Design a protein around this ligand. Structure first.
Ligand SMILES: *[C@@H]1O[C@H](CO)[C@@H](O[C@@H]2O[C@H](CO)[C@@H](O)[C@H](O)[C@H]2NC(C)=O)[C@H](O)[C@H]1NC(C)=O
Ligand SMILES: *[C@@H]1O[C@H](CO)[C@@H](O[C@@H]2O[C@H](CO)[C@@H](O)[C@H](O)[C@H]2NC(C)=O)[C@H](O)[C@H]1NC(C)=O
Ligand SMILES: *[C@@H]1O[C@H](CO)[C@@H](O)[C@H](O)[C@H]1NC(C)=O
Ligand SMILES: *[C@@H]1O[C@H](CO)[C@@H](O)[C@H](O)[C@H]1NC(C)=O
Lengths: 191, 122, 120, 196
């Protein structure tokens, strides 16, 4: 029962494919092979850049040029001692892109009681949607708001007497991929 | 008019229907080296006659006419009330204890096929 | 312009994602019978003209759709038709391997997302 | 003199004509159907018309559709073409006013109100904007500040309210798409009162 491989594409800049191997007797260097099923260059590729945990294979890192979103990515884990103990997963890499967190969070008034939250993301943009969370020093929880490729957020009624905290995260969905996983949270900012 | 699963498999026997109830669907499957035509129908629907027509190219209702190229096994979707006759394949002796058919029935929202009371031995 | 094309592609994407969401879920007990129908798949789909492959499967798509007893196939398919035709502008080659609707819808979604992402 | 129409994003084109029987005829360039409506008098020299393309929430047009829109008046035996337009429906959007306004939660100094958008196409996804306004007892609707929501947000929390006070609230919506797209009508005012 081979370990599951999880692959993430980090800001479409590179990709970590990892697995925890420790769930087996005898310390084992499992190997990774991959291929792009049903396209040009569909040859079986060897890892070429192994990641290690406790001197045992734990992952693979693929460089930008090894990444083809939109093309079916097949990963194979292999027992080096027994060929028949192999497991393969078919992955859609555009569903596995993770953006770097939103940056340059600014607040700006268009009225004495209306503010606008703005921010930046490294590379993608039309390919990103956002989640805005805010709360006041008086709230027991975050208010959240889904935001499209306008990486803006309007707050039309704000209380000067209260202190606000805002944070934003981003996601590669739904226009250029269907990622389920969010970037990490931005640095929070306060009003 | 739903009928969830398909009729049970009896060892060394096959089943056929003589007459198909309205709501039955016959798939448009093709033989090896053949695919259903572009923009073709995925099935034929009994309404009585069949509302579509299956066709292949190189890569109550009656039993529909055999179209040019076909998968050997016809894939059907039956509906509640469909009776299905079982028989031991050529060379096999039939032992009967009760009905040799399966009928699609409908409980409290859950369809089922009755058990054909038939054993096949060589 | 690119922005017109990008918008058309998003709208096509949304129509397809609507169908996928509508069929691929609990509270659709038709799903497993729908999964048995064979859809035909583009050998290559990297550019707008490859949308010919989609167009030719719209008819069987509507049929699989019509099997839901809940979504509004006739309009929906007529809308996808007209957008596809605007976008596509050939001789479509299909893969040997057939697909379920789910695989078929996801292929076409991937196609759209693939072009949209380059468009800006 | 003027012939102006708006698509509500679903199955309605609303037309206004200013220059006895007259009609608007709609000819989609790529569909096997057509529609008309009897123009009826509004202003002294204004006529209005609604083209019902299908059921309320049905998606009867698309962003690639072009509809040829003709105004026809009787003139004896036949019909006379009075006006023409090549109407790109997604370039001329105007939505129904938001509906189902209600108080989610009222305090003494706060209120959360939600709404629903009516016959708005799934094509817009989140690419919408809203504007809201509050009628307070001292002031008129005209004097009420515009509250900008540059996102799809179907609620607002009004802060800095005064206890034991009667307010009214209104909201309107706009798709981001389209060159001649305009704000929807304001919703029916929702009257509410802050707690004592
Ligand atoms: C991708 O894989 C790399 C390499 O395994 C990870 O980088 C490591 O980061 C942690 C945090 O201290 C440590 O194990 C090492 O500092 C790094 N490994 C090195 C330098 O070989 C990285 O965390 C993974 N994820 C991302 C987001 O890049
Ligand atoms: C005002 O009320 C609305 C509607 O009840 C709240 O919005 C919902 O909040 C939950 C949890 O945050 C979300 O999962 C829903 O998606 C929201 N609904 C909609 C349509 O947006 C909203 O949070 C309330 N506002 C405040 C500040 O309390
Ligand atoms: C795993 O591979 C490393 C580096 O190639 C090697 O030094 C280590 O001993 C291996 N572990 C095994 C096979 O147990
Ligand atoms: C951060 O955003 C603000 C507001 O849009 C902008 O004026 C400023 O230049 C940005 N800072 C940088 C350079 O990242």
């Amino acid at each position: 029962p081979l370990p599951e491989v999880q692959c993430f594409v980090f800001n479409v800049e590179y990709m970590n494919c990892t697995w925890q191997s420790s769930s087996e007797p005898q310390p084992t260097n499992l190997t990774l092979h991959y291929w792009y099923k049903n396209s040009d260059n569909d040859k079986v590729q060897k890892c070429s850049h192994y990641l290690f945990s406790e001197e045992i294979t734990s992952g693979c890192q693929l460089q930008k040029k090894e990444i083809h979103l939109y093309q079916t990515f097949v990963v194979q884990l292999q027992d080096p001692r027994e060929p028949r103990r192999q497991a393969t997963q078919m992955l859609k890499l555009q569903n596995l892109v993770i953006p770097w967190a939103p940056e340059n969070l600014t607040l700006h008034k268009l009225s004495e009681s209306q503010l606008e939250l703005n921010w930046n993301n490294r590379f993608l943009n039309h390919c990103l949607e956002h989640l805005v969370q805010y709360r006041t020093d008086w709230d027991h929880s975050w208010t959240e708001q889904s935001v499209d490729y306008r990486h803006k957020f309007s707050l039309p009624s704000v209380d000067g007497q209260k202190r606000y905290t805002f944070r934003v995260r981003s996601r590669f969905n739904p226009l250029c991929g269907s990622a389920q996983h969010w970037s990490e949270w931005s640095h929070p900012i306060h009003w | 008019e739903l009928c969830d699963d398909d009729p049970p498999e009896i060892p060394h026997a096959t089943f056929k229907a003589m007459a198909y109830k309205e709501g039955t669907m016959l798939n448009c499957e093709c033989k090896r080296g053949f695919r259903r035509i572009k923009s073709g129908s995925l099935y034929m629907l009994c309404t009585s006659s069949w509302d579509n027509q299956c066709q292949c190219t190189s890569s109550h209702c009656r039993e529909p006419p055999p179209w040019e190229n076909e998968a050997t096994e016809r894939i059907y979707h039956f509906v509640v009330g469909q009776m299905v006759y079982y028989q031991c394949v050529q060379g096999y002796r039939a032992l009967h204890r009760g009905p040799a058919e399966s009928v699609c029935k409908m409980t409290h929202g859950k369809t089922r096929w009755t058990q054909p009371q038939l054993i096949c031995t060589g | 312009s690119t922005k017109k094309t990008q918008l058309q592609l998003e709208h096509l994407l949304l129509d397809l994602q609507m169908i996928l969401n509508g069929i691929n879920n609990y509270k659709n007990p038709k799903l497993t019978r729908m999964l048995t129908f064979k859809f035909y798949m583009p050998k290559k789909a990297t550019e707008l003209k490859h949308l010919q492959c989609l167009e030719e499967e719209l008819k069987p798509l509507e049929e699989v759709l019509n099997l839901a007893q809940s979504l509004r196939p006739r309009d929906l398919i007529s809308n996808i038709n007209v957008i596809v035709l605007e976008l596509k502008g050939f001789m479509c080659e299909y893969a040997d391997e057939t697909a379920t609707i789910v695989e078929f819808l996801n292929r076409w979604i991937t196609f759209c997302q693939s072009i949209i992402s380059t468009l800006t | 003199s003027q012939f102006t129409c708006f698509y509500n994003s679903r199955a309605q084109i609303s037309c206004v004509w200013s220059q006895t029987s007259c009609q608007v005829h709609a000819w989609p360039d790529r569909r096997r159907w057509q529609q008309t409506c009897e123009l009826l008098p509004v202003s002294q020299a204004s006529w209005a018309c609604n083209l019902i393309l299908g059921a309320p929430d049905s998606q009867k047009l698309t962003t690639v559709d072009i509809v040829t829109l003709r105004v026809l008046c009787r003139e004896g035996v036949r019909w006379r073409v009075m006006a023409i337009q090549d109407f790109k429906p997604f370039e001329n959007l105007r939505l129904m006013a938001p509906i189902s306004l209600q108080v989610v939660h009222v305090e003494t100094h706060r209120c959360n109100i939600s709404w629903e958008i009516s016959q708005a196409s799934h094509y817009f996804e989140r690419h919408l904007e809203f504007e809201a306004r509050t009628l307070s007892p001292g002031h008129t609707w005209e004097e009420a500040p515009l509250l900008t929501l540059k996102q799809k947000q179907e609620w607002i929390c009004l802060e800095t309210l005064t206890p034991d006070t009667q307010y009214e609230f209104q909201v309107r919506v706009k798709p981001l798409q389209g060159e001649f797209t305009t704000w929807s009508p304001w919703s029916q005012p929702l009257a509410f009162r802050t707690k004592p």
